[PDB]
């Protein structure tokens, strides 16, 4: 009972993020020569062209990491990441303009990916 002004006593336990959403692990490769860092809430299939991974597995998903954190890929680096399912309406607009609608248009998102040259459109 030394007083730290404004201090927290946090209750016991752990917080599970993105609970009850399906999760998926995939390998991803920074085939570029510059570092790439990916935010918690970008639609995974829409990330930097030069990331090689199976683009299909990115669709309707984002990184299963704490909100507001990011995964880093140094140039040349390959590593596994875990994904979770997008929620709400499961629609994506803007970003890279690959979806602009329901994440269910798998066939369309992937076609746009292939034509613009996102690596890993399988």
């Amino acid at each position: 009972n030394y007083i730290v002004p404004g201090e927290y006593r946090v209750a016991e336990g752990e917080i599970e993020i993105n609970a009850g959403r399906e999760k998926t692990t995939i390998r991803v490769s920074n085939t570029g020569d510059r570092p790439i860092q990916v935010g918690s809430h970008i639609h995974f299939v829409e990330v930097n062209k030069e990331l090689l991974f199976d683009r299909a597995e990115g669709i309707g998903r984002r990184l299963n990491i704490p909100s507001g954190t990011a995964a880093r890929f140094e140039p040349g680096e390959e590593m596994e990441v875990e994904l979770t399912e997008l929620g709400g309406n499961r629609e994506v607009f803007g970003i890279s303009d690959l979806t602009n609608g329901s994440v269910d248009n798998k066939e369309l998102i992937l076609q746009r990916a292939k034509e613009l040259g996102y690596k890993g459109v399988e």
Binding site: R34, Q37, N48, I95
Partner: peptide
């Protein structure tokens, strides 16, 4: 890419300048 494009489209139409601080993280592109 989207925000960059819409903004420039707005700018071209309205005759105003756009300033950019780009994606340091190379998240969506280099």
């Amino acid at each position: 890419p989207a925000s960059i494009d819409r903004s420039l489209t707005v700018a071209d139409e309205a005759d105003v300048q756009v300033a950019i601080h780009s994606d340091t993280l190379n998240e969506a592109g280099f």
